[PDB]
Design a protein around this ligand. Structure first.
Ligand code: D3X
Ligand code: CA
Ligand code: CA
Ligand code: CA
Ligand code: ZN
Ligand code: ZN
Length: 158
């Protein structure tokens, strides 16, 4: 389906989870965008003001769209495919406990998956893929896209 028809993509962090240090939220999101720019022609830039292509939001329960969150556990986040308005936006369930590590739910790993959706990717049936619909923590310091993730994104861009 939809893809971004431009190379320079902006994102904006709407608000910050209290579960984490601010700089750590910024870093996790930045690093997750970098995963995808590594393998596509895309460039991502954080803006502090105005309309971004991808708005990053932390919210709980009903939060103004048709994708109400479900408390701790279950659904961790959801994102919209490329497009105007809410298109591209990535929402993270504040009822989760977001972290930089193996405790709680890892923000980086989740954001890699969510940004995949923000770029136009669907789910994969390969448990090795980051786009597989089940969260499983892997060491983030050595994380890598599966071949499936790479062929999926490269089918959309580059
Ligand atoms: C590693 O990063 C994540 C791993 C799991 C989740 S998750 O929060 O646990 N999660 C899984 C459930 O997804 C469902 O999967 C179905 C089968 O394809 C789809 O029909 C449906 O649209 C989709 O919501 C919702 C998700 O994928 N958000 O993007 C979120 C991020
Ligand atoms: Ca939840
Ligand atoms: Ca948007
Ligand atoms: Ca939280
Ligand atoms: Zn939402
Ligand atoms: Zn998903």
């Amino acid at each position: 389906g939809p893809v971004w028809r431009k190379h320079y993509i902006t994102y904006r962090i709407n608000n910050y989870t209290p579960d984490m240090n601010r700089e750590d939220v910024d870093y996790a999101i930045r690093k997750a965008f970098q995963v995808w720019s590594n393998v596509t022609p895309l460039k991502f830039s954080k803006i502090n003001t105005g309309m971004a292509d991808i708005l990053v939001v932390f919210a709980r329960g009903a939060h103004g769209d048709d994708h109400a969150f479900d408390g701790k556990g279950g659904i961790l986040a959801h994102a919209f495919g490329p497009g105007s308005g809410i298109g591209g936006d990535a929402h993270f369930d504040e009822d989760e406990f977001w972290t930089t590590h193996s405790g709680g739910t890892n923000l980086f790993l989740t954001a890699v998956h969510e940004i995949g959706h923000s770029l136009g990717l669907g789910h994969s049936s390969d448990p090795k893929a980051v786009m597989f619909p089940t969260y499983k923590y892997v060491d983030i310091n050595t994380f890598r896209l599966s071949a499936d993730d790479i062929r999926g994104i490269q089918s959309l861009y580059g």
